[PDB]
């Protein structure tokens, strides 16, 4: 039904409107003009204002109130650094953060519902356990294939100078491991898409009968064979991962 990120962005956008409506807050509505305050950006490394904050909300940069409030408190931190810790402008910027925390407390439970629907696998040990199993299939089985090392890392353009001009979607075992650590794979199908892409790239570049294609084929065979070996436990984790995401979306509805 409803996209939880859209609902969260409308709450955050509303909060920006309320802070912007507070009196004397104009110096924080828009970025500091470097042509007027010519030494400002020599002091403030991370500038922030209400307009930039609204631009970040509309581009869906904040998955929760935590990242949103972090950038908002930066407005108070920057004015404390430039104008002073107890300057009048820092007090005004603090009144914006005070009203924000008041609005976040009012919608405390709907925000928690929305953030869980946006990041369902946050602290979910089923996703970590599933990722861990996939990583072991790579390191214990696929990387153990004899002479598989050319597939362990991205192709080195220094020695294969035309590879990235021919292969549009390169894939390797390190890139898959990095995807695993990021929990990109919620089931074994997306994982197998990248594994099979390694073999298809070797078929295209090295040729169907090349020694490297035969090694990549064995990398694929041992991966399917190991997934078959762990099929029951993987199905359990895949079930719990998928149902956790759907339940979060239902609770946020």
CA distance 30 to 222: 57
User: Do residues 125 and 230 share a domain?
Assistant: yes
Q: How far are the Cα atoms of 88, 122, 214 from residue 125, in angstroms, in the given order?
A: 47, 9, 36
Residue that is last in its domain, among 118, 146, 173: 118
User: Do residues 181 and 103 share a domain?
Assistant: no
User: Do residues 33 and 131 share a domain?
Assistant: no
Tracing tokens 């909060």 back to the chain, one arrives at 15
User: Do residues 182 and 93 share a domain?
Assistant: no
Residue 23 gets the label, from left (phi > 0), alpha (psi -120 to 50) or beta, of: beta
Burial class (CB in 10 A: 0-12, 13-18, 19+), 5: middle
Count CB-CB contacts under 10 A for residue 85: 8
User: Do residues 139 and 184 share a domain?
Assistant: yes
Q: How far are the Cα atoms of 8, 21, 234 from residue 73, in angstroms, in the given order?
A: 19, 17, 43
User: Do residues 69 and 52 share a domain?
Assistant: yes
Burial 218-247 (b: 16+ CB within 10 A, else e): bbbebbeebbeeeeeebeebbebbeebbee
Count CB-CB contacts under 10 A for residue 24: 12
Tracing tokens 């894939």 back to the chain, one arrives at 171
CA distance 7 to 177: 34
User: For the residues of the chain, what is the DSSP string, one character each?
Assistant: ---HHHHHHHHHHHHHHHHHHSTT-GGGTSPPPTTTSTTSTTT-SS---HHHHHHHHHTT--SSHHHHHHHHHHHHHHHHHHT-TT-HHHHHHHHHHHHHHHHHHHTHHHHHHHHHHHSTTTT-HHHHHHHHHHHHIIIIIITTSTT-GGGTS---TTTSTTHHHH-SS---HHHHHHHHHTT--SSHHHHHHHHHHHHHHHHHHT-TTSHHHHHHHHHHHHHHHHHHHTHHHHHHHHHHHHHHHHHHHHHT-
User: Do residues 7 and 128 share a domain?
Assistant: no
User: Do residues 152 and 202 share a domain?
Assistant: yes
User: Do residues 106 and 16 share a domain?
Assistant: yes
Axis crossing angle, helix 173-181 with helix 125-136, rounded to the nearest 10:
160
Instruction: Give the domain range for residue 192.
Output: 119-253
Tokens of 201: 């790239």
Q: Are 99 and 18 in contact (CB under 8 A)?
A: yes
Q: Are 195 and 220 in contact (CB under 8 A)?
A: yes
User: Do residues 160 and 232 share a domain?
Assistant: yes
Method: X-ray
Residue that is last in its domain, among 69, 102, 118: 118
User: Do residues 80 and 168 share a domain?
Assistant: no
Resolution at which this structure was determined, Å: 2.1
Burial 112-126 (b: 16+ CB within 10 A, else e): ebbbbbbebbeebeb
Q: Which of 81, 78, 111, 119 is nearest to 97 (CA)?
A: 78
| Residues 228, 230, 231, 234, CA torsion sign | negative
Q: How many domains does the chain have?
A: 2
CA distance 196 to 203: 11
CA distance 145 to 153: 14
Q: Which of 120, 121, 104, 118 is nearest to 3 (CA)?
A: 118
Q: Are 30 and 24 in contact (CB under 8 A)?
A: no
Residue that is last in its domain, among 88, 118, 148: 118
User: Do residues 181 and 225 share a domain?
Assistant: yes
Tokens of 19: 């802070």
CA distance 91 to 86: 7
The answer for residues whose C-beta is within 8 angstroms of residue 59's C-beta and 6 or more apart is none
């Amino acid at each position: 039904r409803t996209d939880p990120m859209v609902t969260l962005s409308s709450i955050l956008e509303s909060i920006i409107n309320d802070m912007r409506d507070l009196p004397n807050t104009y110096p924080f509505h828009t970025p500091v003009n470097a042509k007027v305050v010519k030494d400002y950006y020599k002091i403030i490394t991370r500038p922030m204002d209400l307009q930039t904050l609204r631009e970040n909300v509309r581009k869906r940069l904040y998955p929760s109130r935590e990242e949103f409030r972090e950038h908002l408190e930066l407005i108070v931190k920057n004015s404390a650094t430039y104008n002073g810790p107890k300057h009048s402008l820092t007090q005004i910027s603090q009144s914006m953060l005070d009203l924000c925390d008041e609005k976040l407390k009012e919608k405390e439970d709907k925000l928690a519902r929305l953030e869980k629907a946006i990041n369902p696998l946050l602290d979910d040990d089923d996703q970590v356990a599933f990722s861990f199993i996939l990583d072991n299939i790579v390191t214990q089985k696929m990387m153990a294939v004899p002479d598989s090392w050319p597939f362990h890392h991205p192709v080195n353009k220094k020695f294969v100078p035309d590879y990235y001009k021919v292969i549009v979607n390169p894939m390797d075992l390190e890139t898959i491991r990095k995807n695993i650590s990021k929990h990109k794979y919620q089931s074994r199908e997306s994982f197998l898409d990248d594994v099979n892409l390694i073999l298809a790239n070797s078929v295209k570049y090295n040729g169907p009968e090349s020694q490297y294609t035969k090694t990549a084929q064995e990398i694929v065979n041992v991966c399917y064979q190991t997934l078959t070996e762990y099929d029951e436990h993987l199905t359990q984790l895949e079930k719990d991962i998928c149902t956790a995401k759907e339940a979060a979306l239902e609770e946020a509805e």
